[PDB]
Structure formats: structure tokens, C-alpha cells
Enzyme design. Structure first.
Site, PDB file in Angstrom:
ATOM      1  N   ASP A  35       0.822  -1.198   0.000  1.00 28.76           N
ATOM      2  CA  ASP A  35       0.000   0.000   0.000  1.00 28.76           C
ATOM      3  C   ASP A  35       0.863   1.258   0.000  1.00 28.76           C
ATOM      4  OD1 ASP A  35      -1.929   1.917   0.266  1.00 28.76           O
ATOM      5  OD2 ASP A  35      -2.488   1.419   2.336  1.00 28.76           O
ATOM      6  N   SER A 199      -0.560  15.617 -12.039  1.00 29.23           N
ATOM      7  CA  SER A 199      -0.803  15.237 -13.414  1.00 29.23           C
ATOM      8  C   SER A 199      -1.029  16.504 -14.230  1.00 29.23           C
ATOM      9  CB  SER A 199      -2.011  14.299 -13.510  1.00 29.23           C
ATOM     10  OG  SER A 199      -2.359  14.054 -14.858  1.00 29.23           O
TER      11      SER A 199
END
Length: 330
Positions: A35, A199
Site C-alpha cells: 500500500d 498530473s
């Protein structure tokens, strides 16, 4: 040193991925959820409330000759999906794919929430976010990667998750045969303890690319792709019959519909998520309504590039003095 381990989807939908991890002496092998969104290595154990164990493999520290109680230490964590767990702490030898850390904090669960009990395939979590998020008290503990880092050939690990198939976590090296083209690296903020990056935009199907900054985290422990409501609306508007269902808790669509791809930007580079990756099947057995793999982050407080996004890429988690993230197509 290096390590290399295969990671396997827990079910036919890729709801999560499990990776075998050796703990203790003699080795006790548990299947852990790696994770990159958290920083605790915790396991089902001989100490877990009996009624809360249902099929998982447990770690028994008393059977490990290298286990040592971390006296006074406790831990307690909650996740974005509302699940939680807590307990005490041992240090022990932990190996992943041939890479061994001695003195790793192994957090033994005394309590786990129903979600964990109900998932027989996940024996615990291995956190790979930054150690500043680790919940051990009074003395914060380091992640497996942090402990291994200085010994690794290169201070990196990589995630190469499969679509409806196994993939790979590598530690200490970049497998240049595992991706196409070049790796584009992008800046990381560690201020919230995550692999947080920005992004450069998105496209829906064959549509034109929209340049816009989307701050989010690279999170292998989250199944879906969670993005701003504007972006998500633009995606599902291109799917006939799709709608946001409050009763279901997100966008659903008729499985007779064709899903467009979704492209996200990494610098000037582009990662294309094929439409099939965004299908998470019937909301209930026999239903004609399918759950979408791109959902709104509104009310999470952060955008999450979960498995839906990451499995479309070869992803480098670069733990150099100034960390960065790399993405390649594959």
C-alpha cells in the site's frame, strides 16, 4: 541488494493485489496488500480477537526465534474506506522477494474492522508511503522500504500491476524490459506523507487532451481512480446510459455500453487506461448495472491515482534524497 516479488489480484475484478511476505524465523509467509498510500506493516496474528479472524493466515510471534516485543508500543490506523485496525508491535525479520530487513516493525493486530475480517485473502498490509505517516506510538517506526533503502543497489521500488493478471513489485532496480518507451519522472511532495504529484491533464477516449493540473497520490492500496467531479462527469458523459447513483455510491453504467479509454498526463507524456480497466462489474449478482472504475474524489479531500490508473503503467517510486515518481507505458 534487490528484491522481486509477484503480486496477484485477490479476485476477478482486481479489487486488490496480494504479495507474499516472509516474516520471522522460521519464515511465516503471509499475503500482504502492498500500500503506497500508508506506512504501517500490520498483520493478522495469534493476538487478533478470535471472532475477527475468518480464513486469514496469522503471524504467531511466539513461534519466531527472531521476534522481539517492542515494549510499550501500540498502533492504530484508519483507512479512506472507513476500515481500521490496531494492536501492539514486534520487531522481526521480514523478507520480500529475496530482500531481507532485520528489525522490521511488524504491527500485530489485536482488533480489525469487519471489512478486513470479511476478506479472507488479505493477511495484512505493507505500507510503502513515507514513514512520517507510521502510526506506532510512542516511537514512530520505519517502513520496509525505508529500512531497506540504504542497502538497495538503487533507492527505488517499482510497481507493475497487472490487468486481470499478476504483476511485480521490484526493490532496488528498474527492470528495463518491463516497459515500452521511456520513463517520465515528475516531482513529488512529501508534505502529506504520500507519493503526491501533479498530473498535467486528461483526455477521454479519442478526445482532445485537456491541460489542467491535477494534484493526487499514487496509491496501490486504493482500487479505483478518484478524480475531481468535473473530470469524472466529462468521462461518464461519453458512456451511453451512465449515471451517478447516490444509492449505489457512484457512477454506474449498462454493461452493454462500450467504455472509452482515459488518458492522464505525466509531464508531456501520456498514460492510456484502456476502457476495459474501468469496468468493475455488476453492482449486485445478476444486475445489468455495472460499477465504474473512475469515481469522484469530492469529499475525499484528495485525488487518488489508484490501481485503475497505476496498472496501466510501469511506476517508479524513487526514494532518492529528493523523491520523484516515474511513469512509463507498458
Amino acid at each position: 541488494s534487490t528484491g522481486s516479488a509477484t503480486t496477484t489480484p485477490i479476485d476477478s475484478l482486481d479489487d486488490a493485489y496480494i504479495t507474499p511476505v516472509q516474516i520471522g524465523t522460521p519464515a511465516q509467509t503471509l499475503n500482504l496488500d502492498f500500500d503506497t498510500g500508508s506506512s504501517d506493516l500490520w498483520v493478522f496474528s495469534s493476538e487478533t480477537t478470535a471472532s475477527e479472524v475468518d480464513g486469514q493466515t496469522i503471524y504467531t510471534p511466539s513461534k519466531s526465534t527472531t521476534a522481539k516485543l517492542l515494549s510499550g508500543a501500540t498502533w492504530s490506523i484508519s483507512y479512506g474506506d472507513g476500515s481500521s485496525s490496531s494492536g501492539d508491535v514486534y520487531t522481526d525479520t521480514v523478507s520480500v522477494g529475496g530482500l531481507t530487513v532485520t528489525g522490521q516493525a511488524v504491527e500485530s493486530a489485536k482488533k480489525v474492522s469487519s471489512s478486513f475480517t470479511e476478506d479472507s485473502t488479505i493477511d495484512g498490509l505493507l505500507g510503502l508511503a513515507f514513514s512520517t505517516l507510521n502510526t506506532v506510538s510512542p516511537t514512530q517506526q520505519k517502513t520496509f522500504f525505508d529500512n531497506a533503502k540504504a542497502s538497495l543497489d538503487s533507492p527505488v521500488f517499482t510497481a507493475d500491476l497487472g490487468y486481470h493478471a499478476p504483476g511485480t513489485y521490484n526493490f532496488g532496480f528498474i527492470d528495463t524490459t518491463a516497459y515500452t518507451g521511456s520513463i517520465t519522472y515528475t516531482a513529488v511532495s512529501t508534505k502529506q506523507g504520500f507519493w503526491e504529484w501533479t498530473s498535467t491533464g486528461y483526455a477521454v477516449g479519442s478526445g482532445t487532451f485537456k491541460s489542467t493540473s491535477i494534484d493526487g497520490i499514487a496509491d496501490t492500496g486504493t482500487t479505483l481512480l478518484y478524480l475531481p467531479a468535473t473530470v469524472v462527469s466529462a468521462y461518464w458523459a461519453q458512456v451511453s446510459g451512465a449515471k451517478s447513483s447516490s444509492s449505489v455510491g457512484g457512477y454506474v453504467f449498462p454493461c452493454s455500453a462500450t467504455l472509452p479509454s482515459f488518458t492522464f498526463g505525466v509531464g508531456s507524456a501520456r498514460i492510456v487506461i484502456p476502457g476495459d480497466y474501468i469496468d468493475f462489474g455488476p453492482i449486485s449478482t445478476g444486475s445489468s448495472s455495472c460499477f465504474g472504475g473512475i469515481q469522484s474524489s469530492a469529499g475525499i479531500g484528495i485525488n487518488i491515482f489508484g490501481d485503475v490508473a497505476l496498472k496501466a503503467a510501469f511506476v517508479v517510486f524513487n526514494g532518492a534524497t529528493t523523491p520523484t515518481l516515474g511513469f512509463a507505458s507498458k
